[PDB]
Amino acid sequence: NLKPVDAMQCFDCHTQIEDMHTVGKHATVNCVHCHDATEHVETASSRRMGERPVTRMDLEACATCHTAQFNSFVEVRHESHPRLEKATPTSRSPMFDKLIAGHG
Amino acid sequence: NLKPVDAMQCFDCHTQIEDMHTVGKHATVNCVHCHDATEHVETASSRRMGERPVTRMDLEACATCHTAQFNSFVEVRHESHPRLEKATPTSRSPMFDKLIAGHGFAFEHAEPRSHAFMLVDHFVVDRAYGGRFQFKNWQKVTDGMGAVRGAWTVLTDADPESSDQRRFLSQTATAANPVCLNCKTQDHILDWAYMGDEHEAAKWSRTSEVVEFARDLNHPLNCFMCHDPHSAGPRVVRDGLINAVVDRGLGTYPHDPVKSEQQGMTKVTFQRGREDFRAIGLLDTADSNVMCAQCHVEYNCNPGYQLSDGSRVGMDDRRANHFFWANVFDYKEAAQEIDFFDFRHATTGAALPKLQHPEAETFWGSVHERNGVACADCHMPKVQLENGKVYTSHSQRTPRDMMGQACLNCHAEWTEDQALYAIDYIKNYTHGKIVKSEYWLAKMIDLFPVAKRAGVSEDVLNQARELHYDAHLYWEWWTAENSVGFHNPDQARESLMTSISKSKEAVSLLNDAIDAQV
Amino acid sequence: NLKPVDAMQCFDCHTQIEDMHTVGKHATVNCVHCHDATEHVETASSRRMGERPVTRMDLEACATCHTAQFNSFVEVRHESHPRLEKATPTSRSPMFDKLIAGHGFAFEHAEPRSHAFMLVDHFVVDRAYGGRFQFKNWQKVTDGMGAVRGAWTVLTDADPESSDQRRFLSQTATAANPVCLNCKTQDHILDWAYMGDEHEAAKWSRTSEVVEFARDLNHPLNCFMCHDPHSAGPRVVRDGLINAVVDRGLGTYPHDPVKSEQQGMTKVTFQRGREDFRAIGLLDTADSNVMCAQCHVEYNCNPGYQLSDGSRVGMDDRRANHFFWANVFDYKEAAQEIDFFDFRHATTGAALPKLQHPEAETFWGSVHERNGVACADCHMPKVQLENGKVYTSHSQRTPRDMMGQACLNCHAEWTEDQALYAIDYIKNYTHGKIVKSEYWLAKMIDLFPVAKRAGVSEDVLNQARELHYDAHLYWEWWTAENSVGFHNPDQARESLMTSISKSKEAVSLLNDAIDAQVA
Amino acid sequence: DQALYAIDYIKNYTHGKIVKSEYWLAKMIDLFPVAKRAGVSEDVLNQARELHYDAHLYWEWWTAENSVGFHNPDQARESLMTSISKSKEAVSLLNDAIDAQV
Numbered sequence A: 001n002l003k004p005v006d007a008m009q010c011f012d013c014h015t016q017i018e019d020m021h022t023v024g025k026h027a028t029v030n031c032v033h034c035h036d037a038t039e040h041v042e043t044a045s046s047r048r049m050g051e052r053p054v055t056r057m058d059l060e061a062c063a064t065c066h067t068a069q070f071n072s073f074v075e076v077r078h079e080s081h082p083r084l085e086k087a088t089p090t091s092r093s094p095m096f097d098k099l100i101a102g103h104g
Numbered sequence B: 001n002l003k004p005v006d007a008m009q010c011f012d013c014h015t016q017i018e019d020m021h022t023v024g025k026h027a028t029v030n031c032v033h034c035h036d037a038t039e040h041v042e043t044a045s046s047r048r049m050g051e052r053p054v055t056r057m058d059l060e061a062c063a064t065c066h067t068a069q070f071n072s073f074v075e076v077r078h079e080s081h082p083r084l085e086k087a088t089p090t091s092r093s094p095m096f097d098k099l100i101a102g103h104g105f106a107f108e109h110a111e112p113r114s115h116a117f118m119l120v121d122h123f124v125v126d127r128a129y130g131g132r133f134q135f136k137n138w139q140k141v142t143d144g145m146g147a148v149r150g151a152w153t154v155l156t157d158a159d160p161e162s163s164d165q166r167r168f169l170s171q172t173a174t175a176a177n178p179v180c181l182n183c184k185t186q187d188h189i190l191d192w193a194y195m196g197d198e199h200e201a202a203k204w205s206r207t208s209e210v211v212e213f214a215r216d217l218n219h220p221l222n223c224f225m226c227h228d229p230h231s232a233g234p235r236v237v238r239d240g241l242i243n244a245v246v247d248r249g250l251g252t253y254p255h256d257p258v259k260s261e262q263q264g265m266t267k268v269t270f271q272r273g274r275e276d277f278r279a280i281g282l283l284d285t286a287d288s289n290v291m292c293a294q295c296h297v298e299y300n301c302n303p304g305y306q307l308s309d310g311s312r313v314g315m316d317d318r319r320a321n322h323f324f325w326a327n328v329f330d331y332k333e334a335a336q337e338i339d340f341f342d343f344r345h346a347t348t349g350a351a352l353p354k355l356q357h358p359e360a361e362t363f364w365g366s367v368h369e370r371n372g373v374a375c376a377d378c379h380m381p382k383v384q385l386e387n388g389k390v391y392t393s394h395s396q397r398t399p400r401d402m403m404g405q406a407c408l409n410c411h412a413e414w415t416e417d418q419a420l421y422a423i424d425y426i427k428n429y430t431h432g433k434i435v436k437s438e439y440w441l442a443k444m445i446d447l448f449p450v451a452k453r454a455g456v457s458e459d460v461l462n463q464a465r466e467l468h469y470d471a472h473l474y475w476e477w478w479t480a481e482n483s484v485g486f487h488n489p490d491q492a493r494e495s496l497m498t499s500i501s502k503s504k505e506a507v508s509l510l511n512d513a514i515d516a517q518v
Numbered sequence C: 001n002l003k004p005v006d007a008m009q010c011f012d013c014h015t016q017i018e019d020m021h022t023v024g025k026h027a028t029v030n031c032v033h034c035h036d037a038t039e040h041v042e043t044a045s046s047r048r049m050g051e052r053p054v055t056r057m058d059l060e061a062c063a064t065c066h067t068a069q070f071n072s073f074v075e076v077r078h079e080s081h082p083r084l085e086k087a088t089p090t091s092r093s094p095m096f097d098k099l100i101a102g103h104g105f106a107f108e109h110a111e112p113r114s115h116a117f118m119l120v121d122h123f124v125v126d127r128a129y130g131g132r133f134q135f136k137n138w139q140k141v142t143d144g145m146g147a148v149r150g151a152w153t154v155l156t157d158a159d160p161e162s163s164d165q166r167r168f169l170s171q172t173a174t175a176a177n178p179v180c181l182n183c184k185t186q187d188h189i190l191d192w193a194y195m196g197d198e199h200e201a202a203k204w205s206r207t208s209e210v211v212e213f214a215r216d217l218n219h220p221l222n223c224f225m226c227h228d229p230h231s232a233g234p235r236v237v238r239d240g241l242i243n244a245v246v247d248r249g250l251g252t253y254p255h256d257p258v259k260s261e262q263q264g265m266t267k268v269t270f271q272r273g274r275e276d277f278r279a280i281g282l283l284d285t286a287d288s289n290v291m292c293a294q295c296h297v298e299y300n301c302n303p304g305y306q307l308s309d310g311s312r313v314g315m316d317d318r319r320a321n322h323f324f325w326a327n328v329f330d331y332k333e334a335a336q337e338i339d340f341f342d343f344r345h346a347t348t349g350a351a352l353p354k355l356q357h358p359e360a361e362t363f364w365g366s367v368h369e370r371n372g373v374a375c376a377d378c379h380m381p382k383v384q385l386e387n388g389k390v391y392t393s394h395s396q397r398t399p400r401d402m403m404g405q406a407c408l409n410c411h412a413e414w415t416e417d418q419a420l421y422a423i424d425y426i427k428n429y430t431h432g433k434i435v436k437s438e439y440w441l442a443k444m445i446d447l448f449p450v451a452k453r454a455g456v457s458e459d460v461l462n463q464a465r466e467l468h469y470d471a472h473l474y475w476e477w478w479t480a481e482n483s484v485g486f487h488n489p490d491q492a493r494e495s496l497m498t499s500i501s502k503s504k505e506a507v508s509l510l511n512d513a514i515d516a517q518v519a
Numbered sequence D: 001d002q003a004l005y006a007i008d009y010i011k012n013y014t015h016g017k018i019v020k021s022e023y024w025l026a027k028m029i030d031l032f033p034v035a036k037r038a039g040v041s042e043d044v045l046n047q048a049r050e051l052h053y054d055a056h057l058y059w060e061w062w063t064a065e066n067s068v069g070f071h072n073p074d075q076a077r078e079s080l081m082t083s084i085s086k087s088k089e090a091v092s093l094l095n096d097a098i099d100a101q102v
């Protein structure tokens, strides 16, 4: 289970983040949802990063509080034909090979 | 009403039949269901046939006891578009006419449709009999049951008084020969010696007048092509397949000697006048891969030419009835092995192979084949019933129509739409490479006239012709093969990339040579 | 794998079978498909059976060569609501409990469902075996193929160590007897003498312990009930039907002697030793009206009482296995002919008949019957295939599921919705009259205790009881009959109006009598 | 479905012949610049132009006509086969003439 960190400790060094986080609609969302910064906090200075914190870039970081948007995003439209070459008579550019010759 | 005959009387002379019939699941099925042998019994000796018994080859001989399988077989899949030419921008081979120029398939090559129509479609296609045979009218194209009852119930002959192959319509060809019929019907099973060799007991052979032969034939894909009528056990009857698997020792799975042994074939020969006449291949298991490989293979069923010297190889030659039994990457070697090619390209002059529907050879080594999956699992699955006796569907068709049974019972992780999407990914990707291969082939082909007219040397032209053979092979395999890559996606990809590579090489060769003449 | 036997050797002693088998469409079907006679052939003479050969009665004996018919037969129509009690406001007979009080059907009477279930449903219904037999669990109710494979593959017996009929659950009855089984199975066809009379060669009879009999039976509606296994020709095997049509001379169409002659039945008897034992009725034509009338008729299959003196008529009596073979307006006379009634009404004390599903006798005289239409035309039509060999559907069900082939091929002037609307007009009208008949019957019934307690005379009560017999008959025929009038709408209408008329007469009689005693 | 299938049989077959007719027309058309530039005679070019009229007519009737052969399948077939025949004749004429100039 996630344990919240003291964001005020972060904000001592991260004024830009403070200015954004405390005003917006994620003011109640703790940093631990996306960052593991324990060793970073131990080693950073006001101007040097020290140990780099872990930052989650995965979309499931948002999906625990926004499952509807996540699930809508990840839906696969099976009707969007996959791996369908455009340089074919039934697709977008029947004469693409002749016209694009020289390009990757 | 049928009256049974005393089979014991038959068995006195027919020991092979006795051995098969008394042991299998047709031990109780009386001969009269399929044979009228009264005058035969009166006149035969132990070694001479006497009067020939009547043998039913119609599929309704099986339908009285196996109506479910019959009715499933004869169903017409209306969604399988009929008489749809492949050489069109919306079909399999948009540039087919340019690429196949010089071959008879330029006259017409339609997509396949339901099995009921195979014999009539063979008779009426523009490339086969010069337009001699036609449906009685355009309504009859729908009549699958009629075609099954007999081709001549639904077709006409433009000139019953002549038996020569000739053109009745201007843009037709006369490519049909007797070998073709072996993959359309086995009505001739007792009238055709093994391989279509000349034989005193055979009415028909490779060298017969095909129009006369045609007139003797009625039924498509007889039920007994896969099931021995005497034992009811699984078999093949197609000579070319038996020849590859057994005579040439290649095995049922040439890439896998273990599977070949487990799922093998035993050649059984029947004689006339104590001379070998015809043969069947009894299967160890009910292996649809091998059953379907009676027809869904690359073959010779046609005259051609020798690679070595260009001399004609006629219908009289054994090579005119040949199963290569080789995958795409072994094919060129297999064609060299018999010293054969099909046609010379009309524009390039290259000796080329003509490929035909190599589903069986393509399926080899695929993930599904390696996992023990077989054609029937996807194309003629068991029927699932809430309450009922299970039987095997005999409507051989795309799994799209029965995805639950064909795919999803195995692929429990997928919905139908997901499985379809996976098929389409492969087919879409493969088709794109087919199209690109055709683009490059066409680019090469179009350089030949320019090169010849610019005075490029025969040596360079011949180098380009050698590249054309490979560029053609590694492309046409895939327009011929019906799965658009699904049966072996990695192989299709590697092949088509090879085709493109070969064409590009030839294009560079010819352009450079033209530019040097200028 | 089956190995054929030498049928000619069998025929040296079985000339009767030879004469059927060699001429029909099963001449090539070897005996081994249905008989295991090896030890029999080793021990028999033409005059001594020796070891009894085994005869297969399972439907899969036919399914090997006739899978399409078998599979169509065993299909379960899920839309045919299962275990749906008729005595509810949303079913056939909203006031059934009041009206049938004193009869075992009060314990449970569900609507029919698909044929596959007939034997199991007979075994498990609350009125039949005191709740002795149950599905193994509630999942098994779906398993039509399992029921066809055999009842005892899907059912349990509460006490395999006893064979008496008794109540295992409190609100059950033990109405089952061996006659019932004749309309559920013919597994016992070689073990039951004609009519279930006592016979030295019969293992089972009308007087058998039905629980013991039940345990020996497995398959529903055997294929050979309509098709002779030797000739493959059309027949019936049901004794009661052969008895009405042939023995009693009533014919296959009692109201039409011409049609009776054209579409008749020939009784064929089989002996055990020198004595007649069992019989079948070979049909002149493949007449589904008569095939289906093996079961879809009004019958006695039960003990009862005599109208004359009230004495008990037990299962030992021939009357306990009886096809009345009479339309609704001839029934009372037919019951008088055999001096029989079923039960005394619990409230009114009236001697009453119990009616059961008289589809065959109702269909007679209807516009469709007079036009040569038969049950199969609407309920098991030929399959229509774009490409294929035609066969006859054996899924006997409402035409609503196959209106193109059941109705509209004949009624080219109608759309499906129009044909359905015509069905519904008749059913809605008929049901309204059933409901009104029940209202008036209930009104009469409720007056009986009031009249009795007011001191109304027995003479007046007996007059009202005589009216009750008729009010009941002319109502119950139609809750019993499954078409809700469609099979004969004019007859239903006339009958139900008669019921109401009779009840109204009884209500007036009793009310006036009560009022006079007062108050 | 059967009736639709019968329509599609005709339309599919006719369309294939339309496509083939166009293939052959295009092959002929593309030879004209090559022939003119190789110095093929006006007499040969005019012979080919006469064949073009017929090749065109017996093709274009069917792209113009909206039933894709259904209205008269035998006529479409005969016409389109004639178109192809005419184009093939012209192709042979022009190729031979070009090859003779070279």
Ligand code: HEC
Residues within 6 Å of the ligand: A025, A026, A028, A029, A030, A033, A061, A062, A063, A064, A065, A066
């Ligand atoms: C729960 C601990 C959350 C996490 C993890 C994420 N978000 Fe969030 N988000 C949360 C709340 C309580 C709210 C406010 C809801 C309200 O309407 O009051 C939000 C809001 C958003 C919004 C809307 C902002 C706006 O309209 O100004 C967005 C676009 C949003 N959240 C996105 C988002 C992303 C992309 C996340 C992963 C990086 C994410 N949220 C995580 C709660 C939580």
Ligand code: HEC
Residues within 6 Å of the ligand: B025, B026, B028, B029, B030, B033, B061, B062, B063, B064, B065, B066, B223, B224, B227, B229, B231, B232, B233, B234, C064, C065
């Ligand atoms: C009835 C008189 C039959 C005729 C005509 C045909 N078959 Fe048959 N077949 C019949 C029976 C009684 C059985 C055995 C059923 C069982 O499962 O016990 C069979 C079996 C088959 C099989 C299955 C064989 C096996 O699994 O080993 C096949 C493949 C088969 N029959 C095919 C078949 C063919 C192709 C027929 C026409 C040539 C044919 N049968 C006729 C009964 C009858």
Ligand code: HEC
Residues within 6 Å of the ligand: B077, B080, B111, B112, B113, B114, B115, B116, B117, B118, B119, B121, B122, B182, B183, B184, B185, B221, B225, B288, B291, B292, B293, B294, B295, B296, B375, B376, B379, B380, B396, B397, B398
């Ligand atoms: C030779 C006698 C064949 C055998 C054995 C098998 N097939 Fe076949 N198949 C054959 C032909 C000549 C055709 C074309 C028929 C026509 O009139 O065009 C086909 C077609 C198919 C198809 C396409 C069906 C469709 O709906 O379009 C499929 C899916 C197919 N074949 C599969 C298949 C299977 C799985 C086989 C083994 C059970 C099999 N065929 C055998 C010729 C022959």
Ligand code: HEC
Residues within 6 Å of the ligand: B108, B109, B110, B111, B112, B113, B121, B122, B123, B125, B127, B128, B175, B176, B177, B179, B180, B181, B182, B183, B294, B295, B296, B297, B298, B299, B300, B301, B302, B357, B480, B482
């Ligand atoms: C078995 C090795 C075959 C030989 C010999 C011949 N054909 Fe065939 N044919 C075969 C199959 C498996 C299929 C279906 C798959 C496919 O890709 O088409 C076909 C199909 C046809 C068709 C219909 C499709 C078409 O090309 O228009 C026709 C008209 C046809 N075959 C004709 C034909 C001719 C003329 C043959 C001898 C020259 C011939 N076939 C042989 C299998 C086999």
Ligand code: HEC
Residues within 6 Å of the ligand: B059, B062, B063, B066, B069, B070, B071, B073, B221, B222, B223, B224, B225, B226, B227, B286, B287, B288, B291, B292, B376, B390, B391, B392, B393, B394
């Ligand atoms: C090869 C292309 C076949 C043709 C031609 C026919 N059948 Fe077939 N049949 C085939 C397979 C692959 C199977 C399943 C084998 C397995 O065990 O998986 C079958 C099966 C049968 C059976 C057995 C019962 C069943 O499984 O349905 C029967 C009775 C049968 N086939 C009959 C039959 C008929 C009547 C045919 C002509 C209409 C027919 N088969 C052709 C393959 C092939």
Ligand code: HEC
Residues within 6 Å of the ligand: B080, B288, B289, B292, B293, B296, B359, B360, B363, B368, B373, B374, B375, B376, B377, B378, B379, B397, B398, B399, B400, B423, B427, B482, B483, B486, B487
């Ligand atoms: C499942 C794992 C399959 C196996 C085993 C076999 N085939 Fe197949 N085939 C499969 C698919 C997904 C497709 C594409 C179908 C689609 O609708 O996109 C095919 C296609 C064919 C066809 C053409 C069918 C048509 O387009 O109507 C044929 C003739 C065919 N396959 C034959 C065939 C043979 C003979 C097989 C055993 C050697 C075989 N297939 C196996 C899936 C599967």
Ligand code: HEC
Residues within 6 Å of the ligand: C005, C006, C007, C009, C010, C011, C012, C013, C014, C031, C035, C037, C038, C040, C041, C044, C045, C046, C047, C048, C049, C050, C052, C053, C054, C055, C190, C271, C272, C273, C274
């Ligand atoms: C004479 C030597 C017999 C031969 C040979 C066969 N059967 Fe028989 N069978 C015979 C007798 C005397 C009887 C009893 C008749 C009587 O008076 O009751 C029978 C009976 C049968 C039955 C019915 C058994 C029953 O359940 O009541 C059957 C199904 C039967 N026999 C079958 C049969 C078969 C299939 C034979 C050839 C393999 C056969 N019998 C030979 C006398 C003789």
Ligand code: HEC
Residues within 6 Å of the ligand: B028, B064, B065, C025, C026, C029, C030, C033, C061, C062, C063, C064, C065, C066, C223, C224, C227, C228, C229, C231, C232, C233
């Ligand atoms: C295969 C060994 C069979 C067995 C087992 C059963 N039947 Fe049969 N039946 C079989 C054949 C070959 C035929 C003739 C088919 C034809 O049209 O040529 C039949 C026919 C019937 C019929 C139709 C009879 C008629 O129209 O006169 C029926 C009603 C029938 N069979 C029923 C039936 C029953 C009920 C079976 C189990 C007791 C049975 N058959 C088994 C082949 C075989």
Ligand code: HEC
Residues within 6 Å of the ligand: C077, C080, C111, C112, C113, C114, C115, C116, C117, C118, C119, C121, C122, C182, C183, C184, C185, C221, C225, C288, C291, C292, C293, C294, C295, C296, C375, C376, C379, C380, C396, C397, C398
């Ligand atoms: C006695 C052996 C019967 C014969 C012969 C026929 N039917 Fe029947 N039918 C019978 C029973 C015991 C039942 C009820 C089964 C149950 O388990 O509840 C039925 C039911 C029907 C139905 C209703 C089916 C439904 O979907 O609800 C119909 C339509 C029906 N029966 C028709 C019918 C026909 C037309 C017959 C002659 C071909 C026929 N039955 C014969 C008992 C018996």
Ligand code: HEC
Residues within 6 Å of the ligand: C137, C138, C139
């Ligand atoms: C797994 C989590 C289940 C869910 C979801 C459903 N059922 Fe079930 N059911 C389950 C088990 C393990 C069993 C017992 C199996 C056994 O043979 O021991 C059952 C049983 C039933 C029954 C029979 C009940 C009885 O008293 O005999 C019925 C009628 C049944 N299940 C139906 C059913 C329905 C309709 C469900 C969806 C609402 C359902 N079950 C869900 C396991 C699970």
Ligand code: HEC
Residues within 6 Å of the ligand: C108, C109, C110, C111, C112, C113, C121, C122, C123, C125, C127, C128, C175, C176, C177, C179, C180, C181, C182, C183, C294, C295, C296, C297, C298, C299, C300, C301, C302, C356, C357, C480, C482
């Ligand atoms: C033939 C003349 C029959 C006799 C004897 C018995 N039943 Fe029956 N039963 C028969 C038919 C045609 C039907 C279906 C039509 C209908 O109206 O139900 C039935 C149905 C049943 C059912 C299911 C419906 C129900 O009432 O719950 C059961 C449980 C049933 N039959 C039992 C049963 C008993 C106990 C019998 C002897 C007292 C009996 N049936 C005899 C036809 C015939």
Ligand code: HEC
Residues within 6 Å of the ligand: C059, C062, C063, C066, C069, C070, C071, C073, C221, C222, C223, C224, C225, C226, C227, C286, C287, C288, C291, C292, C376, C390, C391, C392, C393, C394
């Ligand atoms: C009476 C209630 C039937 C029972 C029980 C079975 N069948 Fe039947 N069958 C019945 C009818 C009214 C008909 C049509 C007769 C007509 O000529 O109109 C049939 C027909 C058949 C046939 C013949 C082929 C066909 O028309 O489909 C067969 C082979 C057949 N029936 C088989 C069969 C089987 C296997 C049964 C048990 C599952 C069975 N029938 C029962 C009436 C009745």
Ligand code: HEC
Residues within 6 Å of the ligand: C080, C288, C289, C292, C293, C296, C359, C360, C363, C368, C373, C374, C375, C376, C377, C378, C379, C397, C398, C399, C400, C423, C427, C482, C483, C486, C487
């Ligand atoms: C068409 C002209 C019919 C004839 C001939 C027979 N029946 Fe019928 N039946 C018919 C209809 C329109 C209905 C009502 C069905 C509905 O869904 O509303 C019925 C009903 C039955 C039932 C009950 C079916 C059910 O409710 O599931 C049975 C058991 C039944 N019919 C039996 C039966 C018999 C035995 C027939 C010949 C004597 C008969 N029907 C003929 C239409 C027609």
Ligand code: HEC
Residues within 6 Å of the ligand: B137, B138, B139, D003, D004, D006, D007, D073, D074
């Ligand atoms: C009656 C007013 C018709 C209309 C509407 C349609 N068709 Fe027709 N068609 C009709 C006749 C009398 C015939 C000739 C019958 C004969 O055998 O002599 C036909 C023929 C066809 C054909 C065959 C064409 C040919 O051989 O050249 C086809 C393919 C056909 N009909 C199809 C068809 C379609 C699809 C229709 C709806 C658009 C249609 N027809 C209407 C009579 C009538």
Ligand SMILES: [Ca+2]
Residues within 6 Å of the ligand: B080, B081, B111, B112, B113
């Ligand atoms: Ca197809």
Ligand SMILES: [Ca+2]
Residues within 6 Å of the ligand: B298, B299, B300, B354, B355, B356
């Ligand atoms: Ca080839």
